[PDB]
Enzyme design. Structure first.
Site, PDB file in Angstrom:
ATOM      1  N   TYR A  60     118.696  13.383  41.156  1.00  0.00           N
ATOM      2  CA  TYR A  60     118.468  11.934  41.144  1.00  0.00           C
ATOM      3  C   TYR A  60     119.678  11.092  41.560  1.00  0.00           C
ATOM      4  O   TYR A  60     119.574   9.864  41.632  1.00  0.00           O
ATOM      5  CB  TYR A  60     118.012  11.503  39.751  1.00  0.00           C
ATOM      6  CG  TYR A  60     116.709  12.145  39.316  1.00  0.00           C
ATOM      7  CD1 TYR A  60     116.710  13.369  38.656  1.00  0.00           C
ATOM      8  CD2 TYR A  60     115.482  11.534  39.558  1.00  0.00           C
ATOM      9  CE1 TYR A  60     115.535  13.967  38.243  1.00  0.00           C
ATOM     10  CE2 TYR A  60     114.293  12.120  39.137  1.00  0.00           C
ATOM     11  CZ  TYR A  60     114.326  13.344  38.486  1.00  0.00           C
ATOM     12  OH  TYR A  60     113.175  13.974  38.065  1.00  0.00           O
ATOM     13  N   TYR A  82     106.221  14.859  43.952  1.00  0.00           N
ATOM     14  CA  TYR A  82     106.102  14.441  42.555  1.00  0.00           C
ATOM     15  C   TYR A  82     105.703  12.956  42.463  1.00  0.00           C
ATOM     16  O   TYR A  82     104.801  12.588  41.679  1.00  0.00           O
ATOM     17  CB  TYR A  82     107.405  14.699  41.791  1.00  0.00           C
ATOM     18  CG  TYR A  82     107.284  14.309  40.355  1.00  0.00           C
ATOM     19  CD1 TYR A  82     106.723  15.186  39.413  1.00  0.00           C
ATOM     20  CD2 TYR A  82     107.648  13.025  39.934  1.00  0.00           C
ATOM     21  CE1 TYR A  82     106.558  14.804  38.098  1.00  0.00           C
ATOM     22  CE2 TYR A  82     107.487  12.630  38.612  1.00  0.00           C
ATOM     23  CZ  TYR A  82     106.965  13.510  37.694  1.00  0.00           C
ATOM     24  OH  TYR A  82     106.784  13.120  36.385  1.00  0.00           O
ATOM     25  N   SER A 122     105.051   8.010  36.064  1.00  0.00           N
ATOM     26  CA  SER A 122     106.492   8.140  36.178  1.00  0.00           C
ATOM     27  C   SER A 122     107.045   6.878  36.831  1.00  0.00           C
ATOM     28  O   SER A 122     106.359   6.240  37.622  1.00  0.00           O
ATOM     29  CB  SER A 122     106.853   9.352  37.041  1.00  0.00           C
ATOM     30  OG  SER A 122     108.228   9.329  37.384  1.00  0.00           O
ATOM     31  N   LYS A 168     102.080  11.237  40.756  1.00  0.00           N
ATOM     32  CA  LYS A 168     101.968  10.178  39.749  1.00  0.00           C
ATOM     33  C   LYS A 168     101.376   8.880  40.319  1.00  0.00           C
ATOM     34  O   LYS A 168     100.690   8.142  39.614  1.00  0.00           O
ATOM     35  CB  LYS A 168     103.313   9.984  39.071  1.00  0.00           C
ATOM     36  CG  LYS A 168     103.790  11.250  38.335  1.00  0.00           C
ATOM     37  CD  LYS A 168     102.668  11.937  37.537  1.00  0.00           C
ATOM     38  CE  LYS A 168     103.178  13.088  36.660  1.00  0.00           C
ATOM     39  NZ  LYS A 168     104.070  12.653  35.548  1.00  0.00           N
TER      40      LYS A 168
HETATM   41  O1  LIG Z   1     118.221  12.702  35.471  1.00  0.00           O
HETATM   42  C1  LIG Z   1     117.272  11.948  35.665  1.00  0.00           C
HETATM   43  O2  LIG Z   1     115.986  12.390  35.416  1.00  0.00           O
HETATM   44  C2  LIG Z   1     114.932  11.561  35.727  1.00  0.00           C
HETATM   45  C3  LIG Z   1     113.631  11.998  35.501  1.00  0.00           C
HETATM   46  C4  LIG Z   1     112.537  11.179  35.801  1.00  0.00           C
HETATM   47  O3  LIG Z   1     111.305  11.671  35.540  1.00  0.00           O
HETATM   48  C5  LIG Z   1     112.702   9.893  36.351  1.00  0.00           C
HETATM   49  C6  LIG Z   1     114.019   9.469  36.574  1.00  0.00           C
HETATM   50  C7  LIG Z   1     115.123  10.297  36.271  1.00  0.00           C
HETATM   51  C8  LIG Z   1     116.425   9.883  36.511  1.00  0.00           C
HETATM   52  O4  LIG Z   1     116.915   8.747  37.050  1.00  0.00           O
HETATM   53  C9  LIG Z   1     118.267   8.781  37.105  1.00  0.00           C
HETATM   54  C10 LIG Z   1     119.166   7.826  37.563  1.00  0.00           C
HETATM   55  C11 LIG Z   1     120.514   8.089  37.518  1.00  0.00           C
HETATM   56  O5  LIG Z   1     121.376   7.140  37.973  1.00  0.00           O
HETATM   57  C12 LIG Z   1     120.949   9.314  37.004  1.00  0.00           C
HETATM   58  C13 LIG Z   1     120.038  10.276  36.542  1.00  0.00           C
HETATM   59  C14 LIG Z   1     118.671   9.998  36.584  1.00  0.00           C
HETATM   60  C15 LIG Z   1     117.514  10.693  36.215  1.00  0.00           C
END
Ligand SMILES: O=c1oc2cc(O)ccc2c2oc3cc(O)ccc3c12
Ligand SMILES: O=c1oc2cc(O)ccc2c2oc3cc(O)ccc3c12
Ligand SMILES: [Cl-]
Ligand SMILES: [Cl-]
Lengths: 260, 260
Positions: free
Chosen positions: A202, A157, A143, A161
């Site tokens: 996030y 999490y 990830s 990873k």
């Molecule tokens: O929604 C997400 O799901 C993820 C899932 C993952 O496994 C890794 C990163 C993200 C991730 O990074 C973001 C950055 C933003 O500015 C907005 C939303 C996300 C968002």
């Protein structure tokens, strides 16, 4: 022989019921591999994926396994080989996401996450090494949160990873005695039907934005100004498991469209 | 007040019976902290360390815990606070080494390693966050094998520490709400009475060299042409847990004398 293609090959793909895994299974089939569609839950969904692969002109079979249970990983791989005669490629998309401040993480949650994301993927690699033809391919899922992206309340999490990154670098040493390469893909935020239920974790004050605003914010994190999609990961997996991907070995590739 | 010193502070150190942990416990005492000498096995050895710390002029107490058992981590920290009134610093040196080709790693060995090295250290951090005074310090133990050093047949251990690297980067985010910094030290080969029983695993055809040759080979891997010693790690831990180490936060420091 066609460069990049997987004609005559047999591939096994975990987490194929949904999302990234499904797109990977279908893609390896589009590339000419026969596919073992391994999945954790819905048999109907998995047979859907099998059906797409057959519609593309390749053969496929759905074999369920609980990847938390190492005995089921063994049987999955035994059955894969018995059905198709051999196995060349193994891709794990197995994993679960988790959120919470360190102070609140329980024993039970630690175990829920590590049993699949880390222990499960480790033994998928073990069984893939044990069953694979020489010159084969193993790809695990890391990830962007392992090293490239820091999300508060996402320590469990992230570490699940981080382990995978170190595993693959060393797996490439051990697995070289069958000329099998071992890599991981480290996707960033990738849109699936599940993305919207967790995207708030996030973003600071994420629940004060709508799902669509959160998706758009994720899109703007890449300098390409779009979201990552399951096909983005499938495309890269397809390259890694091809003949032409051979010199990429023991590496983790972050797939975030340039966000980091 | 003396810069770098820990006068008036209370520190808890795991894995203190032996080796690196013992040197860390004694060092934090030399720096002026009162020390909870936490250990896993020999009470006599732990009381030895307590005695050294008292001989230096600081107070100490030995409190045993099996760091694989999260309930014992909770009681350890409760008892630390009840004895000394408060706790400022927590350093984990808890861990076990493991070797074997991927193909031969068992479920039982995976669990032996991860339960202590990864899960145990995670919950040491949780309980440290929960018990620590504001402005405190958490240091976990990673390894040069996590990212900087690739040893064939060492995948399980390497990944157990890869997890810790990711943990600390995110722990620093969560623990900032009590102004607690979180880091890890990642030692390379460090000489203790145990070094000689495993040094053969790190060298191709290692059993065809004597223990002394293997120690000398480890020494030559650093451009300083000496081995790493437990005091080398203690010195760095001491800096990190001091006031002056504050701006180092969320980082893993590889301590290999320049080998990598
Ligand atoms: O929604 C997400 O799901 C993820 C899932 C993952 O496994 C890794 C990163 C993200 C991730 O990074 C973001 C950055 C933003 O500015 C907005 C939303 C996300 C968002
Ligand atoms: O014996 C060792 O124990 C270790 C323990 C660790 O936790 C990390 C690294 C090492 C390590 O690296 C080496 C390199 C050499 O060339 C010779 C010996 C060693 C050696
Ligand atoms: Cl699935
Ligand atoms: Cl100990």
């Amino acid at each position: 022989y066609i460069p990049g293609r997987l004609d005559g090959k047999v591939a096994l793909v975990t987490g194929s019921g949904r999302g990234i895994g499904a797109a990977v299974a279908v893609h390896l089939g589009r590339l000419g591999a026969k596919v073992v569609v391994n999945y954790a839950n819905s048999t109907k969904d998995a047979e859907k994926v099998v059906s797409e692969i057959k519609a593309l002109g390749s053969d496929a079979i759905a074999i369920k396994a609980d990847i938390r249970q190492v005995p089921e990983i063994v049987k999955l791989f035994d059955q894969a080989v018995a059905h198709f005669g051999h196995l060349d490629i193994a891709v794990s998309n197995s994993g679960v996401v988790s959120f919470g401040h360190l102070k609140d993480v329980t024993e039970e949650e630690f175990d829920r996450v590590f049993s699949l994301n880390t222990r499960g993927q480790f033994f998928v690699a073990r069984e893939a090494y044990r069953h694979l033809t020489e010159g084969g391919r193993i790809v695990l899922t890391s990830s962007n949160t392992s090293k490239d992206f820091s999300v508060p309340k996402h320590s469990l999490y992230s570490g699940s990873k981080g382990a995978v990154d170190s595993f693959v670098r060393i797996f490439s040493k051990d697995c070289g005695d069958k000329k099998i390469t071992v890599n991981a893909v480290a996707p960033g935020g990738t849109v699936t039907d599940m993305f919207h239920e967790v995207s708030h974790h996030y973003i600071p004050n994420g629940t004060s934005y709508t799902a669509e605003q959160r998706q758009q914010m994720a899109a703007h994190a890449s300098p390409l100004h779009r979201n990552g999609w399951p096909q983005d990961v499938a495309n890269v997996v397809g390259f890694l498991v091809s003949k032409e991907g051979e010199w990429v070995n023991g590496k983790v590739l972050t797939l975030d469209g340039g966000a980091a």
